[PDB]
Amino acid sequence: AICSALPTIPYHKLADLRYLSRGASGTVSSARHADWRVQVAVKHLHIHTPLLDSERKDVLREAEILHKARFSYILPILGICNEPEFLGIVTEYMPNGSLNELLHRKTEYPDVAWPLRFRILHEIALGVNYLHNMTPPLLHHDLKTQNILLDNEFHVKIADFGLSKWGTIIYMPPENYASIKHDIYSYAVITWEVLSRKQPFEDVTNPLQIMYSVSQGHRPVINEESLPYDIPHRARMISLIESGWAQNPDERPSFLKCLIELEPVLRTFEEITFLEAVIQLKKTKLQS
Ligand SMILES: CNC(=O)c1cc(Oc2ccc(NC(=O)Nc3ccc(SCC(=O)O)c(F)c3)c(F)c2)ccn1
């Protein structure tokens, strides 16, 4: 068959290395490739010497998986740095951060237009659906707003800042306190979070109260105050959320079924309204 090797990038080709304030502190950095002349991001362990050989294989495993899963809506890996001095994963740089920031930093982004929100939800489904259609199927099991990255034109790139795979319980289905019905549950909560710009279980301080409540069937509140009546396709989106976070995992739809129903919804938006939505947030961000 047709096989292709991932490039090995020398450490001294990464210029202007700077820490980034994301993921675990001291695990994500930005830089520039001296030859390709593009901005990049570098994911790495905490800095120490010597790097264990068991630690190197942990990084190569994540890199091999991200290499196998290359797709239009998945964070593109560019290569790996494997030397005695440094050990990291180099990917493309997403300039506009994560969906977490866009939703809840209401001063930098006072308004987020509906067409952009619906396209974001659409592209999130496209990336995960591609992961599930692989052989063997790839399961994320960590879908949250912090893992949804946005590129130069606010297109979705799905990523994973965690390191152990190779508050934070609000995206977990109740049966958790193999297993393909996990990601669609996280997606239902993200959909509610996008359409509301509110924190799920805002007034609940103790996480044990959250875990107990969702185990009894309680979900984030859906009323006029959380989801106003002027949301486009409000009735159809609520049916998707409620079926997405169903108590019984067998009653949750696949990401394919969601995409089939999302296609006619997104089609009712004019194509130009997407660009005008992106030009607006970048304009409001100019004066800040
Ligand atoms: C302001 N802009 C930024 O700060 C920025 C930082 C940035 O840093 C990184 C973030 C993540 C990763 N790595 C990663 O996403 N790996 C991975 C592995 C398996 C799966 S498959 C499903 C699953 O298992 O979750 C998957 F989807 C993803 C990385 F290498 C670098 C990248 C872009 N922009």
Author numbering: 5 to 170, 188 to 198, 206 to 316
Paper quotes:
We report development of CSR35 that displayed >10-fold selective inhibition of RIPK2 versus VEGFR2, the target of regorafenib. Two RIPK2 molecules were found in the asymmetric unit. As expected, CSR35 was bound to a DFG-out conformation and retained interactions characteristic of most type II inhibitors. The pyridine nitrogen and hydrogen of the amide formed hydrogen bonds with the hinge region (Met98). The urea was engaged in hydrogen bonds with the catalytic residue Glu66 and the backbone NH of Asp164 of the DXG motif. But most interestingly, one of the monomers revealed that Lys169 of the activation loop forms an ionic–ionic interaction with the carboxylate of the ligand and occupied a similar position as Arg171 in the previously reported structure. Engagement of Lys169 was consistent with the predicted result from sequence alignments and likely accounts for modest inhibitory activity differences between WT and R171C mutant RIPK2. Since the carboxylic acid will be deprotonated at pH 7.4, this functional group potentially forms an ionic–ionic interaction with the activation loop. Notably, CSR35 lacked significant activity in the in vitro enzymatic assay against the primary regorafenib target VEGFR2 (35.8 ± 2.6% inhibition at 20 μM), which does not have a basic residue in the same position as established by a published structure of VEGFR2 in the DFG-out conformation.
RIPK2 is a caspase recruitment domain (CARD) containing kinase that has been implicated in nucleotide binding and oligomerization domain 1 and 2 (NOD1 and NOD2) signaling. NOD-RIPK2 interactions result in activation of nuclear factor κB (NF-κB) and mitogen-activated protein (MAP) kinase pathways to promote the transcription of pro-inflammatory cytokines. This signaling pathway potentially plays a crucial role in an array of pathological conditions including inflammatory bowel disease, Crohn’s disease and multiple sclerosis. Herein, we report the design of receptor-interacting protein kinase 2 (RIPK2) inhibitors based on pan-kinase inhibitor regorafenib that aim to engage basic activation loop residues Lys169 or Arg171.
